[PDB]
Symmetry: C2
Subunit: 877 residues, 2 copies
């Protein structure tokens, strides 16, 4: 648990000192200036009191056991001091520095004593809502709603400096170190469930395992917005930070899959700080601009034109009302009101009329200082106008006072009122487009797979084709051998022939019809481009003879004993009007299998043109990949006389995904060229690199599919039919009504040694699930083409796979029918099969039905006095 | 002249008022708070004094004639008031507003009275070095070295607001309007010759003629750096500013040709303000970074990696000296020194050692606030350290204090010391790369723009081929007819055949050899893609028959009477290995003829993929175009199995340039596809659209070449041989030595009613010439692989082509040989042929040789007393 870290009751500072040049000095001073509500205990034999607080000589002399310990002493003593703490019985410790070794001994000690470590080389922790400042930083912070996580101590200090100088308030501020024991995935759950947090910010430099990162981020992304920034993109940056290099395009794919957003530099980062706070969520994507000058708005438009933004169109009634406010303003005929010497009176006369309509979703006000309209007065007038209007709740506001010297007070007043403000134009447009893109991506996230009948045994035949190949010892196959495997999955391939020498080669080429393409087959060297036998636009046989003989003599000269089993030759179709593509499937070691698409030619450089994605795929994901690739001009749409059809390409990609996920023996696949001719798609040359063995065939992925084999039909006690099945994201509406007609007593659960009761956010969170560590079943009824929920059950498992917590909810007017018992039996089966030890829960004593059911099971029920909670324990053996 | 505007002796304010809401009030208040050294005369009958100064009722009652007048009254009175001024005899007037009409009457009045106007709707003029503030703005300014020119009053006010709130000092600040009488080209000369100006900044929104703009910018760019920003890029911005759309890449081409630099937005604009001042010019491109944190430097590196920047390598001696300054600093082994908790002492001990080496060309220091090193004291220490070092002269310095709240005082101190400072990392790298790119481009500007190869008159035969075609009335041509014209200029083309129907078409297709490509010829509809009858790569005669019959039927059903003179058919080469390009030559109305290069296919849209240039071209310019196109990835280098050779493509482009410049009857040329195969380049299909008539074939262009037909060999009075020829940029070194051994009296000339004497910058300026409005001849002698200059002569003409000023310089020890007389005769011939009226000059009375020569000519000499200047006048005819 993380409650002894994010909510301690007592703290012991080991290494507290009266020397101002020490970290213990700064830690004590920061801790005593925060507003903490517990004791701070300095431990040192070199003083009798530190900053006015009585000190203790050693850990064993402490009057009681603390919750949190901070080690400000040197690294040499680390391993000893930890041991002492283990004897005392403390729960968590923060370590200042380590010499890059003894990580093994540190982890062993922590596991032995059941202790949690905040990574060494960590700047610390700040919790303003508890008045906690267990940190080494020199700048203060304020209460707020924004949580931040950082990785490097240099990064942590740089970012907190930039932040405090940006002044923005915070909810949490955690600086990880080597992430030896506590990692990002664990923190994400706590932060998502927190109530003071409204957005989350990350700064990542490296990761240990991306599967759990993606899973937890996916789970937590439906509550609040989440943003990222990464910096390992150039070789010098890679070497200075000591990180691996060749996985950058996969990071974009993972970020897209988790539903998060990426920012480029730190200049857009303080815009991100300004927009995550002070800005309310949007309801659309229509923008209205007003200003007292032509150029600024113009500079904005270009920016909005480079990100494909949407403008607003004014109604004729609003246009008429705006007229008569002042003449010589043609700007009534465009979504950018324009003035040159306007006063604040015109500003208010425009604001009041504009706010009354239903024409846009966000308003952008630009001011260039002028004699007619001073900055401070305009700011005050705008603030009051926004205050007194009743429609201001349904509109987003953006401001831009463009005078640095003369607009400091106006900006301070805006910040006090809680209004966003930006230094320059197209810094507002960047934030607006950021938010629009976030809303769209969150619109398209909801997706999970479904498999109607899995696959038949015919693919097993295909499987045998590989088995014998690995029995034969072969590790790579060619098109001629690979044809049946592709055919089994619905792929189309062209036929090819093999000739032992030139004579038969031409003897068959004359039959199939010139032109004709040639190639070799030599297992030793995969670089057939070294030979480059491709031939086109010719029909004479002598050229074929000379080319074949030259290739034969060359391969003999390089190595006469090199094995050659023939020469591959194929016919040509009407490729002049055809389009060339290229497809690759690789095995990245951070994310697992990966699918990349691009164009043909030796120009292939994956970091440049490859558009990349993660399996598995369905039609929608493939369509989105194709659209993204085309729009970014990575792939041309009309390279030929005809357009490109996207349905066929998406279907081909789905087939590829099915094939690679089903068969794990494949390690690499390359289709080059891929011939796209209108509605038809065909493969010209295909290469497979395969390896034997596989452990589980599922852990190798990052996202796991929907378990349709648990879906059940059950006839109730009274002969009624219903369906028991796992939960889906689409059940959120149904879940909100079902919670109304449920008794209050059963709505309690235990979270972090506290008792709370379910709310709507809890159910919405419950809909977004990974079916590995958390499970939920629903019982559903079908009436008149609607689904109505009767009962829910949930189970959550711990990281070490030794405990779990369960909860059950049933609707009113449904009691006594055994529904709860059936759900509990279904949960017991699944949990015992998963491999857990025991199951824990709680309920009220006044509620007799649940305790009666638990007794019927015969599993332990304990009763807590003075609190009124009954604990249920079910040992699965 | 512009001296009565930029240096007035007296000003009259027409419309001065005591009402604080009028522009006359603000003009009077601004004028009286500047430090002007002349009278300010208010003219009004509605008051007896304005702000304590006696007023006059009307223009006729003014005691004397003013130099400058500002019209602050209404527009209705404009035409009357100007007339009165014309009677009084004033020289220049600034107009505040006009109703978009009566521009013609204003022009007529000004030309009638010989008066100059600063465009209506202009914010005014600021000259701090004269204490002049003839403006309507509310923001003060300071003395400096940066000149700014702006176009729109909204733009002008926005920019000056952004500037004063940026606070930077200025040399001049001119706000044009409709540019009715005074334009950018005229101001560029004055600003180039000015001494208080160090750099020039522009904000352009539209231009009248790009010819003179490019010419003057080219002339003035060799003195100081010049930067631009343009904003007409999106259709909404175009409509809000009322400008035409389709010329953006042409603007890039022209800006490159003139030697200027372009910036994107205003966020890089105050970086430009900070870098144009406070930063000394570089001597190289090697950069060194030091910081107290890892992430900031990393964020910089990526940016420097995205612009192909250069880092520095440390010498072993410097590395050794740096070691022992503080242990545990791995950063000794990279060009980014890195610290975590460093102090000021480490900063100084690093700076002193680093400045002593010769390893880099610029140093970038980053600071993240921390307890060990407070911002203010670190800034003070850095400033003093830079002060006391002797090597600080030869190094450029960049600073970046990254704490906004806590680094205000340090930034102010840096600004006081005259050091550049930037808010964020990679805002510094942007400026550094800006300056590096500017230096490189200015390195590559100098050229030898000529037509030395010329051409024989036998290509007149080619001309006849066009003439008869237009005599016959034809307006377009096909490949079959165009073959000989392309052949005459050294271009290669493939043969093609014409068939009357399907039968003979296939009958010859079988002979030429499959595959075969078809096309039609219909004068009415040029969209043969609309017919879409072209078939490629198929090898069956009956398919050709069907395709031709379908084309026949389709063209008949569209229009049965449509002309058909046959069907074009050609035989494919080994095209599969070949690479495809596309070339087009158009006639833009702003810049003239234009040449664009790109890739084939219906995807062709010039705004995106076309790389564009201005004729004429030589090998170097074509090579640079090709390199830029490849690097920006608009064109690929290895779409095929082989690379792309650049020499052949550049030669092809040079041939195209020669062809289009020679023959003006061609209005459009299109070569698509262009087949590139190794060193061979061939044309597949070519289309020419031609029109008759042409004025002079030279004014139609934007840059005019070197006039090699004036190069002469001359034998002197004593019989010595020398060469008289026009000047080139390469003569700058030789020009300096020649100026040492020249008498002192003759070194004077008359500029703006002042006598000055030539310096080295004047000669460097004279080397950059346009051979239209200014000419210069040199007399040169060859000695064992060197050129030594004996004498120079120059002539400068006025805009209206009615006056000109001349100057002659002869070296010591070479008098009495007639060299001066020969140069003068050569100048007289050229000037009379140009079409001028008279020639003006001056010299000293004590110098008797020059006046003796002028008398020998017999042309007027007048003598001025109390001045010692003798004026020479020579009336050509």
């Amino acid at each position: 648990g993380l409650e002894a870290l994010l909510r301690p009751k007592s703290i012991a500072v080991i290494g507290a000192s009266m020397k101002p040049n020490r970290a213990g000095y700064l830690m004590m001073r920061n801790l005593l200036a925060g507003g903490f509500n517990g004791p701070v205990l300095p431990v040192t034999p070199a003083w009798k009191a530190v900053l006015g607080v009585l000190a203790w000589p050693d850990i064993a002399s402490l009057p009681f056991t603390p919750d949190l310990a901070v080690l400000c002493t040197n690294a040499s003593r680390n391993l000893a001091l930890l041991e002492e703490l283990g004897e005392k019985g403390c729960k968590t410790c923060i370590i200042l520095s380590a010499p890059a070794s003894q990580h093994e001994d540190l982890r062993a000690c922590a596991l032995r004593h059941n202790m949690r470590l905040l990574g060494p080389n960590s700047l610390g922790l700040l919790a303003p809502w508890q008045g906690l400042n267990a940190s080494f930083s020199p700048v203060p912070i304020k209460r707020g709603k924004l949580a931040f996580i950082s990785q490097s101590a240099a990064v942590s200090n740089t970012i907190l400096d930039w932040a405090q100088q940006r002044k923005m308030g915070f909810s949490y501020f955690i600086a990880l170190g080597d992430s030896l024991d506590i990692d990002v995935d664990e923190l994400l759950d706590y932060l998502a469930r927190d109530s003071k947090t409204s957005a989350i910010l990350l700064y990542l430099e490296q990761l240990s395992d991306a599967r759990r990162f993606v899973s937890a981020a996916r789970s937590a992304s439906r509550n609040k917005p989440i943003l990222v920034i990464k910096s390992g993109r150039s070789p010098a940056a890679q070497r200075l930070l000591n990180t691996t290099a060749g996985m950058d395009p996969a990071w974009d794919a993972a970020i897209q899959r988790a539903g998060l957003l990426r920012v480029q530099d730190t200049h857009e980062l303080f815009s991100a700080v300004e927009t995550l706070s002070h800005m309310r969520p949007l309801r659309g994507d229509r923008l209205m601009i007003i200003s007292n000058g032509a150029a600024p708005a113009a500079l904005a438009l270009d920016a909005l034109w480079s990100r494909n933004g949407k403008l607003a169109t004014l109604s004729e009634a609003t246009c008429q009302k705006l007229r008569d406010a002042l003449p010589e303003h043609v700007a009534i005929s465009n979504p950018l009101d324009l003035r040159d010497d306007a006063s604040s009176e015109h500003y208010i006369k425009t604001l009041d009329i504009l706010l009354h309509s239903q024409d846009f979703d966000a308003l952008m006000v630009i001011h260039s200082p002028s004699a007619a309209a001073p900055a401070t007065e305009s700011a005050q007038v705008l603030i009051e106008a926004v205050k007194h209007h009743p429609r201001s709740k349904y509109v987003s506001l953006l401001t831009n006072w463009c005078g640095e010297h003369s607009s400091q007070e106006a900006r301070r007043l805006f910040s006090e009122a809680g209004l966003p403000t930006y230094r320059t134009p197209e810094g507002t447009i960047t934030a607006f487009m950021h938010m629009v893109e976030y809303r769209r991506n969150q619109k398209q996230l909801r997706e999970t797979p479904a498999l109607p009948s899995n696959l038949t045994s015919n693919t097993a035949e295909a499987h045998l084709l590989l088995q014998q190949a690995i029995a034969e010892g072969a590790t790579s196959l060619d098109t001629h051998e690979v044809q049946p495997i592709l055919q089994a999955y619905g792929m189309n391939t062209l036929p090819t022939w093999i000739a032992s020498d030139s004579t038969e080669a031409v003897h068959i080429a004359e039959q199939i019809g010139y032109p004709v393409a040639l190639k070799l087959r030599s297992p030793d060297i995969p670089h057939k481009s070294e030979v480059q036998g491709v031939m086109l636009y010719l029909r004479t046989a002598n050229e074929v003879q000379q080319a074949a003989n030259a290739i034969f003599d060359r391969v003999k000269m390089a190595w006469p004993q090199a094995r050659v089993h023939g020469l591959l030759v194929q016919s040509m179709a009407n490729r002049a009007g055809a389009q060339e593509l290229r497809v690759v499937v690789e095995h990245d070691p951070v994310f697992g299998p990966l699918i990349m698409l691009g164009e043909g030619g030796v120009e292939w450089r994956p970091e440049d043109q490859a558009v990349v994605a993660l399996p598995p795929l369905n039609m929608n994901l493939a369509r989105y990949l194709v659209i993204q690739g085309i729009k970014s001009k990575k792939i041309r749409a009309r390279s030929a006389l005809r357009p490109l059809d996207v349905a066929g390409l998406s279907q081909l990609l789905v087939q590829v995904s099915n094939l690679i996920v089903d068969c794990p023996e494949i390690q690499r696949l390359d289709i080059h060229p891929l011939l796209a001719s209108g509605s038809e798609f065909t493969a010209l040359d295909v290469t497979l690199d395969i390896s034997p063995f596989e452990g589980d065939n599922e852990s190798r992925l990052a996202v796991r599919p929907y378990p349709h084999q648990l879906e059940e039909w059950v006839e109730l006690k009274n002969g009624e039919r219903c369906l028991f099945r796992p939960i889906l994201p689409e059940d959120e509406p149904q879940l909100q009504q079902f919670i109304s007609r449920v008794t209050k007593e059963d709505l309690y659960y235990r979270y972090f040694s506290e008792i709370n009761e379910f709310t709507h956010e809890d159910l919405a969170n419950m809909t977004q699930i990974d079916y590995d560590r958390e499970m939920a079943f629903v019982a559903v009824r079908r009436i008149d083409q609607t689904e109505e929920i009767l009962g829910v059950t949930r189970a959550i498992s711990d990281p070490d796979n030794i405990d779990a917590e369960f909860a059950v909810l049933v609707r009113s007017d449904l009691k006594g029918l055994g529904l709860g018992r059936r759900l509990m039996e279904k949960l017991i089966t699944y949990t015992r099969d998963h491999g857990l030890q025991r199951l824990n829960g709680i309920t009220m004593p006044n509620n007799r039905g649940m305790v009666a059911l638990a007794r019927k099971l015969g599993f332990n029920v304990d009763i807590q006095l003075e609190e009124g909670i009954v604990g249920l324990t079910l040992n699965l053996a």
